[PDB]
Every structure is written in structure tokens, then in C-alpha cells.
Design a protein around this ligand. Structure first.
Ligand SMILES: Nc1ncnc2c1ncn2[C@@H]1O[C@@H]2COP(=O)(O)O[C@H]2[C@H]1O
Ligand SMILES: Nc1ncnc2c1ncn2[C@@H]1O[C@@H]2COP(=O)(O)O[C@H]2[C@H]1O
Ligand SMILES: [Zn+2]
Ligand SMILES: [Zn+2]
Lengths: 327, 325
């Protein structure tokens, strides 16, 4: 019964990188997305700011969480909760103080919460190559991302689920656009272009009298939020090793299952999905070297020196995985 | 009747085909009869081993999904865009520039480009928080839907007209069609035209004046513009046809405006029947959209599009003359 006290204790670390999200998932009876989102909304006073009825928020969150699949090892409600909490921490970085409006903050967090809802455990390419109904619906482009958005928004229409019921028409319109822009940017096929623009921004960065980042147009503002959520989505390798390894174990299980389906169909097996020819350690070093570090090193420069500890952890984790290779 | 229809279809290769007459003489099956005629004309059934019964079955099914109660965006418009693309594909300057598969894609794309159109615009669907807009995240809403429906119908009993195409040919065709239809989104017109101009400025042709394309990027770009031109070809057709198209689109527009007014929404351009100037609208449409596009296409295939451009300018002059004062 006092399990509630332990859960409440763990939630006290909501503003910290390295939150025990798996512990929270268990303590909450598999409701990590609901309790973490609720905690963050309270912390940021979002219910008051946007006049969100608490029962409406909880009802929508439970419904949203219900639409993530419990039988998918990585792309589930725990991942959603993790991305939400990570985005929440990134939004609080000193270099971004007073930069974003409450609506933009709300957009980034909501986008993080719905960014992978109803994920089937297989990639866009798998869905395209197998002529899936989802790929048919979305014409082979940002198939899953479009779906995550459609489901996330559609659920707002369920009984007592419209958490944005008291926003003005203009606020709702702006929020919807920002959320779409953010989730569509999580498509890995857009990673290189997204990173290229972030690098350009860092190279031409301008700060205010306080040293805080200066963003004076939608293009730049949405770009930072897109990269912020993308960094959160790719934050596993930057977390304490015990968390990172659990995430890796989970994604490998999901990858291997996709590989088994591809093999059975006579399809070429996707990278990292062949359990018979796998090099988990080498794959993590590659993932960090070619994707995660290039991105995070750039984000760290944008908010320097705010993310130095996060970058240090990432580099330590890369060294650790690399050390398991010299055989 | 079947004799009259057969005779009208004899001009399938001519700009200005009596598409409305064909729609009447075919029991409102202009898309099916015109697509079939074009496929036979290009020997596409034998080339891609397309069972006649399969093609007809798919075509009738596709045509059935265009709304007969929508004045403009219906099966007649689809048939007209298909026939217009078919003629533009026979442009001397583009002779032998495209493969049979690419030709099949351009024509297929034209046939399905507006399927299941509800009679209202993307902006209307977005502003009314429609299910379509919810599904497609306010991004090229109708275009995405037209493609989804067009492809899904191929899965109906005896409707897979691409059944005998190789796995790669099917993948290639699907990609080209998506690329083409998404390009019909008017919100992409200015960028599409801008890039067309760029192509014209650096174009390269043979001694005989045949256009030289170097890769898929070039070939698909020309195809996107070709179909876009076909979609915006009404003002370049014989006046009798152009006026019928205008009457039809205005009716569709006014009906949308009535819905916007009732909902308390801002009425879209040309949709307010109480403050409408049809003639002035046509002149503006030609001056800012249609002429700039066709003048550019004309240069690309110079001088094969001169007659089309001449007709457009004649129609512009006529519509302007219907404006008093
Ligand atoms: N721990 C991880 N190890 C390897 N690849 C990962 C890991 N976390 C995320 N990814 C990859 O990063 C991608 C981010 O977007 P997706 O969820 O589409 O797919 C994810 C994987 O391809
Ligand atoms: N005859 C016409 N008169 C006015 N506008 C037209 C005419 N034909 C096409 N259009 C416009 O061109 C657009 C082409 O794409 P849409 O069908 O989305 O919407 C069409 C109209 O906005
Ligand atoms: Zn994710
Ligand atoms: Zn059209």
C-alpha cells in the first residue's frame, strides 16, 4: 500500500537526467506516461495556465497510454514517458530560460507524449516493403510519424479527453501545427538534414544580454524544438549505463523480432535485426559514433555549457561498449 | 450511339476533345472509355500484359469513386486531365523521352489524381477539423487521399492492372505516381513553376529540337509539370469547353462558400456568390497562374505548345471583353 509513497518519492526526480523510469513504470502499475506527464504538468503549472481539468488530463493520459503496445519491447509507453521527461529536462536548460512560451512548451511535451503511439514494433521500411495498410494510407512517407500524430490527436475526441478544451481557437491552431512539425521531424530519414540545420544555427548563433539563445522567427523556434525532441528520442546512450543497457536490450529484442519476420518472408534483414549475425556492442558504438554523438555534441554547443555532463556520460558509455569489443 | 461515341473518340489525340459529349455518349463513363481508348492507342495492354477485363474492371471501379454530384472535381475532369496528359506526352519535343512504364505512370496518376474529391478544398477540410485533415495532419490532405484510394482500388477483385509488372517496375511506378499527384497540390505551384523555369534556362535539346533529360529527377520533374499543366488546362481549351469548365467550378466554389458562411468562417476567394465576379476571376486566374505556367512549358517544348498558348491568350482577351466599363 505504501508503494504509493515510493512512487511519489521517485517522481521527485522528474527534473533530473537519469530518472528511474523503469522503476516508475513498475511502481505505477505500468502507467509511467500518465504519472510522469501529470507530474510535469503540475510542476510547470500547465493545468492552471491552460485551464485543464485534472480529470480530463488523467482520462486522456490513460487513454493515450492504452494505445501504446505493451507487447512491443522498446516503442512502448515507457519509451514515451522517457522522451517526455527528457524533453522536460532539456526545456529547463539555462540557455533556454524564458525563450519559449507556455504554448510552445506545451507543444513540445505533448508531441513527446504522442510521438510513438500505436507503434507496431516494426520500422517504416518494413511497413513499406510489405505493402502494409499504413504505408498505403500514407503513401510511403513518414508512415509511422503521420500515424502517431493522427492517433494522438484523434484520442482527444474521446469522452472527457480534450485537454485543450479551454485554449483559444488561435492557441489550438498554433499548438496543432507545432506538434505536427515536431513529430514529423522524428522521422530518421530526416536526421541528416535536421542535424545540418542545427549545426548551421550553432555556427551563426546569437545570444541575448543574458547569454540566452535568441530565436526571433518561427523557423528557428520550431527548429530548436524539433531537434530538442529528436535529442530526447535519441537520449538512451546519454543516460547512466544501467538505464542505457536496459533500453538497448529492449530495442534489440524488438529488432530481432522484426528480423525474424523479414527472414520468414524471404526479405533482406534490416541492419541490427539478424539475431544469427548480430554484433550488439559494435552496433552501439556505431550508433553513437555516426548518429547520437554528432547530434548531442551539436546540441551541447548550442546550449553550452549546460549539457556538458550529458555529453560526458555519452562519451563514457561509448568507451564502455567499445571496451567489450577488444577480444 | 455506340457509333457516335466511337467517332468522337477518334479525336483522342487532339487538344479540345469533346469530353462532355463523350461523357454523355458513354453513359457517364468518360474516364473508362477514354482511358481504355488511350491504353489501346499506346498498346499498353499488350506491353504490360494487362487483361482487358482487368483494366475495364479497375477503370469502372475508379470512375465509380469520383462523385457524380460534384460539379467540377468529378470523373469528367479526371478523363479530361488524362486525355490532356496523353496529348502532352505526344509532344514532338518529348518524343521517345519516356519509357512505357513512365508513360503508364503519368496517365495512371492523371486518372486517379482527384478520386473521391468531396467538392471542398484542403483549406476547408483543415479549418473544419475534418476526419480527412485529421488523418493526414493538414499536409496535402486531398492529394494523399486521392493516391491512397487510387492504389487501394487495385486490390479489388480483378482490378490489379499491374499484376504482370515486375516487383521493381511496381515499386518504380508507385513512386512516380506519388511524386506526380502530390505535385498537383496548389500550395506547391510557385515552387514547382520556379524549378520549371530553372530547367528551361539550362535546357539542352538535339538538332531536331528534342528535349534531353539526364536522370529520374529531370524526367519526374517534367512529368509533374506536365500533369500540373493538364490539371490547369481548362483556359487553354476551345472557349466552348473552357466556359463549361468555368461554370462547373464556380458552382462547386459557391457551394463551399455557402458552407463557410453558414459555419461563420471566412469565405474563400471566389466562393462568395453574393460578391462574385466570375469574369474578373478568370482573367486573374489566367494572368497570375495559368499563363505563367504555360508560357514556361511552351518554352520547354518550343514551339510545340504555341497553338495551346495562342488559344489561352484568345480566351483571356474574350473573358476580359465581357467585363464592362
Ligand atoms: N539504444 C539504441 N540502440 C540502437 N539504435 C537505437 C537505439 N535507440 C534508438 N535507436 C535508433 O534510433 C531510431 C530513432 O527513431 P526510430 O524509433 O524510428 O528508430 C530508432 C532506432 O533505429
Ligand atoms: N476554370 C477555373 N477557374 C478558376 N480556378 C480554376 C479553374 N480550373 C482550376 N482552377 C483552380 O486551379 C486549382 C487546381 O487544383 P485544385 O483542383 O485543388 O483547385 C483548382 C482551382 O483553385
Ligand atoms: Zn521514439
Ligand atoms: Zn484536378
Amino acid at each position: 500500500t505504501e508503494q504509493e509513497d515510493v512512487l511519489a518519492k521517485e517522481l521527485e526526480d522528474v527534473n533530473k537526467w537519469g530518472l528511474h523510469v523503469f522503476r516508475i513504470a513498475e511502481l505505477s502499475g505500468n502507467r509511467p506516461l500518465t504519472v510522469i506527464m501529470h507530474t510535469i504538468f503540475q510542476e510547470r503549472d500547465l493545468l492552471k495556465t491552460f485551464k485543464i481539468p485534472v480529470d480530463t488530463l488523467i482520462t486522456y493520459l490513460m487513454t493515450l497510454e492504452d494505445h501504446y503496445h505493451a507487447d512491443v519491447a522498446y516503442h512502448n509507453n515507457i519509451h514515451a514517458a522517457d522522451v517526455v521527461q527528457s524533453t522536460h529536462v532539456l526545456l529547463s536548460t539555462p540557455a533556454l530560460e524564458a525563450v519559449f512560451t507556455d504554448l510552445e512548451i506545451l507543444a513540445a511535451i505533448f508531441a513527446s507524449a504522442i510521438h510513438n503511439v500505436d507503434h507496431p514494433g516494426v520500422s517504416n521500411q518494413f511497413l513499406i516493403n510489405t505493402n502494409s495498410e499504413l504505408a498505403l494510407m500514407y503513401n510511403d512517407s513518414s508512415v509511422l510519424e503521420n500515424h502517431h500524430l493522427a492517433v494522438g490527436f484523434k484520442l482527444l475526441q474521446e469522452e472527457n479527453c480534450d485537454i485543450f478544451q479551454n485554449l483559444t481557437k488561435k492557441q489550438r491552431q498554433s499548438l496543432r501545427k507545432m506538434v505536427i512539425d515536431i513529430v514529423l521531424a522524428t522521422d530518421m530519414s530526416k536526421h541528416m538534414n535536421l542535424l545540418a540545420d542545427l549545426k548551421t544555427m550553432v555556427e551563426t548563433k546569437k545570444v541575448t544580454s543574458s547569454g540566452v539563445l535568441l530565436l526571433d522567427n518561427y523557423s528557428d523556434r520550431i527548429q530548436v524544438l524539433q531537434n530538442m525532441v529528436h535529442c530526447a528520442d535519441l537520449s538512451n546512450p546519454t543516460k547512466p549505463l544501467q538505464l542505457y543497457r536496459q533500453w538497448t536490450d529492449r530495442i534489440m529484442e524488438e529488432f530481432f523480432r522484426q528480423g525474424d519476420r523479414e527472414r520468414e518472408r524471404g526479405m533482406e534483414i534490416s541492419p541490427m535485426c539478424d539475431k544469427h549475425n548480430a554484433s550488439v556492442e559494435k552496433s552501439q558504438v556505431g550508433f553513437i559514433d555516426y548518429i547520437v554523438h554528432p547530434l548531442w555534441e551539436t546540441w551541447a554547443d548550442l546550449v553550452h555549457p549546460d549539457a556538458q555532463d550529458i555529453l560526458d556520460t555519452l562519451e563514457d558509455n561509448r568507451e564502455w561498449y567499445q571496451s567489450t569489443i577488444p577480444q
